[PDB]
Design a protein around this ligand. Structure first.
Ligand SMILES: CN(C)C(=O)COc1cccc(F)c1
Ligand SMILES: CN(C)C(=O)COc1cccc(F)c1
Ligand SMILES: [Ca+2]
Ligand SMILES: [Ca+2]
Lengths: 204, 204
C-alpha cells in the first residue's frame, strides 16, 4: 500500500512537470499573439499547477520565472497590483528582479530588455501623475548619462516626455516578444505539446 | 499563419482533455485517501483547467461532474458555501443534483448513495441548530415511511437523533469511497497517468 502510494506520488510529480512546460508554452503563445483572455486563463492554470509541485529542478525554476516575468510585464501598467511582500515594489520593478535572476545568457537582447523595463518602470508612474512614486522607483532601480536624463524628466513633472516616446512601452513589448519567440522555439518539443501535436496531425 | 494557429489551438484542446482526466484521477485518490490539502490544491487546478476547455464530449462532461460532485461532498458540512446561483441550495443538495445528472448506471450502490445524501442533507442542518433550514431542505428534496420519519425528526428539533447515527455522515463517505474506487480503476489507464507511471517504473 505504501509502496503504491509512493509510486503514485512520483507519477503525479512527473505529470505536473509536463503540465508546467505545456502551460508555459501556451502562456508564451498567448503573450506573443496578444490574446489577453487566453493569457489570463492560462496564467490561472499555471499558478495552480505550480502550487502542487514541491521540489523543482533548475529547468523548472527557470520555467516558473518565465511565467512570472510575463505576468508582471502584462500587468506593467496596473500600479494597484502587488507582486511582492514589499507593497512598494511596482509590477515592472518585480519583472526587472526576475529578469536579473533567470539563469540565461546576458546577450545584447537581454540588456536592451533590462534597460527598456527600467525606463518604462519610471514612465508608467509619470503617465499616471505619480511623480513622487516615479522618484522612489528611480532610487530603487538606479542605485550615468541615461540615469541623469531620467532624473531630469522626473523633476520636470511632465506626464508625457519625448524620451518615453523614443524608448516606449510598445518598444519594450516588441523586444520581449523577440525573446518569447526563442522560448517558444525551445519548448515546442516538450512532451505534452509534442504528443498533442502528433494526435492533431494524425487526424488530418 | 492562420493554419498554424488553428492546429496549435486544437493541440491545446487535446492536452487540456488529458490534463482534465489526470486531475480527476488525482482528485479521486486524494478524496479516497483523506488527503484534505492535496484535494484542495488539486481541485484548484481542475477548476482552472476546466475554464480553458470550451466544447466538451459526453465523457468530459461526466468527468467534470465527478470532480464537482466530490467537491460538494467534501464541503457537505460547510453550510456557508454557495455552489448554485440559487443561494438557498446547500452543498449536499447540489451534490444530489449532480448525482442525478451523471450518465451512469443506477445500480443498488447508486440508490444507497442517493438516499444517504438525502438523509445527511437534513442531518447537517439539524446538527447546526438550523431547524427551519432543515425543513426547507426537506421540502426541496422530498417532493413515504423514510420521508415521514425524517419530518418527525425535524419537528422534534433535536440536534442529535439515533436515526442519523445509523445512516451517518461517515457511512455516506464510505459508500461514496466505494464508487470512487471504481472511477479510479476506470481512469487509471488514461494517457497522462499511464505515461507518467511508465517513466517512474523505467527509473526503478
Ligand atoms: C507573487 N505571485 C502570487 C505571482 O507571481 C503570481 O503570478 C504567477 C505565478 C506563477 C505562474 C504565473 F504564470 C504567474
Ligand atoms: C459552481 N462552482 C464554482 C464549482 O462547481 C466549483 O467546483 C468545481 C468545479 C470544477 C471542478 C472541480 F473539481 C470543482
Ligand atoms: Ca500602487
Ligand atoms: Ca448557508
Amino acid at each position: 500500500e505504501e509502496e503504491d502510494a509512493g509510486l503514485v506520488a512520483e507519477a503525479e510529480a512527473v505529470a505536473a512537470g509536463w503540465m508546467l512546460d505545456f502551460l508555459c508554452l501556451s502562456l508564451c503563445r498567448a503573450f506573443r499573439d496578444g490574446r489577453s483572455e487566453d493569457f489570463r486563463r492560462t496564467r490561472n492554470s499555471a499558478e495552480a499547477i505550480i502550487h502542487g509541485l514541491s521540489s523543482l529542478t533548475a529547468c523548472q525554476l527557470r520555467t516558473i520565472y518565465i511565467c512570472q516575468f510575463l505576468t508582471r510585464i502584462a500587468a506593467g501598467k496596473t500600479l494597484d497590483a502587488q507582486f511582492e511582500n514589499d507593497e512598494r515594489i511596482t509590477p515592472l520593478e518585480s519583472a526587472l528582479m526576475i529578469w536579473g535572476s533567470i539563469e540565461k545568457e546576458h546577450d545584447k537582447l537581454h540588456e536592451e530588455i533590462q534597460n527598456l523595463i527600467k525606463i518604462q518602470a519610471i514612465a508608467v508612474c509619470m503617465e499616471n501623475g505619480n511623480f513622487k512614486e516615479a522618484e522612489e522607483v528611480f532610487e530603487r532601480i538606479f542605485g550615468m548619462p541615461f540615469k541623469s536624463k531620467l532624473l531630469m524628466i522626473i523633476s520636470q513633472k511632465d506626464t508625457f516626455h519625448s524620451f518615453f516616446q523614443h524608448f516606449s512601452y510598445n518598444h519594450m513589448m516588441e523586444k520581449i516578444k523577440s525573446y518569447v519567440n526563442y522560448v517558444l522555439s525551445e519548448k515546442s518539443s516538450t512532451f505534452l505539446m509534442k504528443a498533442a501535436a502528433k494526435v492533431v496531425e494524425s487526424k488530418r
